[PDB]
Design a protein around this ligand. Structure first.
Ligand code: WV9
Length: 765
């Protein structure tokens, strides 16, 4: 029954529009297979299309916004794109039709409406680009009856081992199609849908834009060769229409030109399913999908006061759909330094200069291939897996579809190397690499990242202890299934736990350091003079200068987070030998957090270093770091220390802004200095952990219950309103929010842990 559910999940999740890096396109969860992609662009001139054409996601003054209004990766969804440059409002509805043996069928409708400012007669080039990778597969465009192109639908017939037999149909569409009176129409037709079938070596099929332009350029060359010139040039839109040449190959360009508003359909028909998929099928399944999305959202995301209002419902639907709608499939080689240089042991004073030298050897090489199914922080800037980010992405996703979240976790843990390492940023394949400068691609097997995925596993474990609808919850509804998953994952959790202790160990015994345990002390490998990237909190102030004597209170608390989980999971598997180890380590951490990190002078937690005179110094920077034992749920509810932290969280003059908790205190000397990334702004993910821990303390008998209740009430309000106001004004989820003005700053389309807001509103943790 475990194997059974697994196969049903595979079959359910196989197809999706899993290319979040481009505005719209589809690929299955298969590394070398069939992919599609949409491109569009107004044409007003002879040179303009090259600049107007749209394909990969960006965010500039040209684009008002875009994103999913509804989405379930099982069923499909509706995406809206608001394009100022090209005067278009576009809809992309995508839908999956289960059936057959090969992961079902699917259909998409592309509708573009010219906006109010666009010329009523605008000419817009639309391209649907289709590639297929694999040695033993075939794909052919059925030629048309007409001489120059297609009056009607374009039919591609294809086959591969993976997908069996299929047909992909690009319908004729609605829309005026412009007609050219020029001489050239005697050779290229007056204007019709056209198809080019090409072959390129498999590894470059992803480069749709250059591949396209190569053809456009070859057509224009041919005009110039065949005496077409400026004495009498054809219209631009016809200069940019490809000579029809359908056939077979691993690339198929389908091109339409519309005047005015337009719409057309894509129908992908798995041959091993029922009958082929029709446009009426599309329409039905789209409507059905909304009803289902609707009914689920009300149950799963029941917004409590004061957010029960319809405005907040729209907002939640947007933040949710954008988060889950970023789910992508990625495949290929990564760039890793497998040298394991001594300098990366960071044992020296000045270890950052050593480590710079080791990198300067450039021993990194491509390895893999690897595959990851995962949600992402940022369609337009970083459409890729980020390790601790996924901890946050999956909390709302798990609520929606726990089996979907377990899939993603499984996908992440399958990356883990023999040592227990997962690179914190997954750049898989040449396509993924195109977005990242060569200088930042290399991962380092000594670089950790908060193990936030345990937080999801935590929630699954509590859910466990206490057909699309069915599948979504099958791993909790069927206890044996739940358990077997954990049985299989457990070895890797532990491996990672062990890897943290192996690679990210602090030095107690080599200095004048007394503490209840000689084991427990941690220090993030990777830190440079001004940064500690690995911790998540790029430029939060740390001991200066960095030093092998450092111990970081956040890291220790993450280890705490892991042990607590290992205990929970271990006990469910009865690994008794193990659970006793875990308890002896939990105990030590709790003590050692105090002995090593607590400050009585300052009334919060601190990082440590060791002095110019070689003794342990606390280094206090009041902020997120300072609250860490609390954020990660490690303090007892009656603890004096908790109370003192509640004072610090509460205190406007330190961390409490009208807009949420400040990353760093206004009284810290580093407030709003340098890049000011984590040095004042409000970050939703850390605010989320604060909110969840406050509510825990609020709903339990104890001393701080009623202060906690106040702070919860108010924080949740402040965080939700801030993210909401900004969404209302700008259309965007933002990466962080400004403590003074409440304005969203840095990156837009951050969905991204900003979406945690849907869970904040819905409460009952
Ligand atoms: C115009 O726009 C500027 C574009 C631009 C694009 C990508 C980049 C590199 C990658 C950015 C990492 C972001 N972020 C950092 C957070 O601190 C960290 O906690 C988190 O894990 C990670 C992701 O969520 C830099 C700049």
């Amino acid at each position: 029954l475990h194997s059974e559910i697994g196969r049903l999940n595979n079959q359910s999740l196989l197809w999706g529009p899993y290319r979040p890096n481009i505005y719209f396109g589809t690929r299955p969860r298969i590394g070398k297979s069939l992919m599609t992609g949409l491109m569009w662009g107004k044409i007003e001139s002879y040179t303009d299309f090259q600049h107007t054409v749209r394909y990969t996601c960006e965010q500039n003054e040209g684009m008002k916004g875009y994103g999913w209004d509804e989405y379930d990766p099982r069923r499909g969804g509706i995406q809206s794109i608001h394009d100022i440059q090209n005067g278009l409002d576009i809809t992309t509805s995508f839908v999956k039709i289960p059936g057959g043996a090969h992961g079902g069928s699917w259909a998409a409708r592309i509708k573009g409406t010219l906006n109010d400012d666009a010329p009523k007669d605008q000419k817009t080039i639309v391209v649907f680009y289709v590639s297929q990778e694999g040695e033993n597969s075939e794909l052919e465009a059925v030629p048309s009856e007409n001489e120059f192109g297609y009056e009607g639908d374009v039919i591609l017939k294809g086959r591969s081992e993976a997908l069996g037999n299929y047909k992909l149909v690009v319908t004729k569409g609605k829309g005026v199609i412009p007609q050219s009176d020029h001489d050239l129409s005697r050779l290229r037709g007056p204007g019709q849908t056209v198809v080019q079938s090409l072959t390129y070596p498999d590894e470059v099929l992803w480069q749709a834009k250059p591949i396209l332009f190569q053809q456009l350029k070859a057509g224009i060359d041919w005009l110039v060769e065949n005496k077409y010139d400026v004495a009498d040039p054809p219209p631009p839109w016809q200069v940019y229409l490809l000579a029809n040449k359908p056939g077979s190959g691993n690339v198929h360009i389908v091109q339409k030109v519309f005047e005015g508003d337009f719409e057309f359909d894509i129908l992908f028909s798995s041959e091993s399913a029922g009958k082929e998929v029709t446009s009426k099928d599309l329409e039905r399944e789209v409507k059905q999908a909304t009803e289902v999305f609707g009914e689920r959202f009300a149950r799963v995301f029941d917004l409590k006061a004061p957010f029960q209002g319809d405005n907040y419902k729209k907002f939640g639907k947007s933040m949710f759909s954008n988060l889950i709608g970023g789910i992508g499939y990625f495949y290929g080689h990564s760039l890793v330094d497998r040298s394991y240089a001594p300098e990366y042991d960071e044992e020296n004073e000045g270890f950052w200069e050593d480590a710079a030298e080791a990198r300067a050897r450039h021993q990194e090489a491509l390895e893999g291939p690897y595959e990851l199914f995962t949600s992402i922080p940022s369609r337009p800037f970083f459409p890729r897996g980020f390790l601790w980010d996924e901890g946050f992405h999956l909390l709302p996703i798990a609520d929606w579809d726990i089996d979907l979240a377990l899939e993603i976790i499984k996908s992440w843990y399958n990356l883990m190397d023999e040592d227990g390492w997962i690179a914190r940023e997954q750049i898989l394949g040449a396509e993924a690499r195109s977005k990242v400068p060569k200088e930042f691609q290399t991962q380092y097997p000594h670089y950790a990242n908060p193990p936030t995925l345990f937080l999801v596993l935590d929630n699954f474990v509590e859910r466990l202890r206490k057909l699309d609808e069915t599948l979504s919850t099958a791993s909790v509804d069927n206890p044996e299934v739940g358990l077997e998953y954990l049985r299989r994952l457990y070895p890797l959790l532990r491996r990672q736990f062990d890897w943290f202790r192996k690679t990210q160990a602090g030095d107690i015994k080599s200095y004048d350091r007394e503490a209840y345990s000689t084991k427990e002390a941690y220090r993030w490998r990777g830190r440079t003079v001004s940064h500690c990237l690995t911790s998540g909190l790029d430029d939060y102030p740390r001991p200066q200068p960095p030093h092998p004597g450092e111990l970081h209170v956040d890291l220790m608390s993450w280890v705490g987070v892991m042990v607590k989980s290992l205990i929970s999971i271990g006990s469910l598997l009865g690994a008794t030998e193990d659970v006793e180890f875990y308890t002896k380590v939990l105990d030590a951490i709790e003590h050692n957090l105090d002995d090593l990190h607590w400050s009585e002078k300052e009334g919060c937690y601190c990082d440590a270093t060791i002095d110019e005179f070689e003794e342990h110094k606390l280094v206090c920077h009041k902020g997120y770091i300072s609250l860490f034992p609390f954020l990660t749920g490690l303090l007892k509810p009656d603890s004096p220390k908790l109370g003192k932290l509640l004072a610090l969280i509460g205190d406007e003059s330190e961390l409490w802004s009208p807009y949420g908790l400040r990353s760093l205190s206004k009284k810290d000397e580093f407030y709003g200095t340098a890049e000011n990334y984590w040095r004042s702004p409000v970050w939703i993910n850390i605010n989320y952990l604060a909110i969840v821990q406050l509510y825990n303390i609020a709903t339990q008998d104890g001393p701080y219950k009623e202060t906690a209740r106040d702070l919860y009430t108010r924080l949740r309000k402040n965080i939700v309103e801030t993210v909401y106001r900004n969404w209302e004004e700008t259309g965007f989820a933002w990466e962080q929010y400004n403590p003074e003005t409440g304005k969203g700053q840095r990156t837009q389309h951050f969905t991204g842990w900003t979406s945690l807001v849907v869970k904040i509103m819905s409460g009952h943790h």
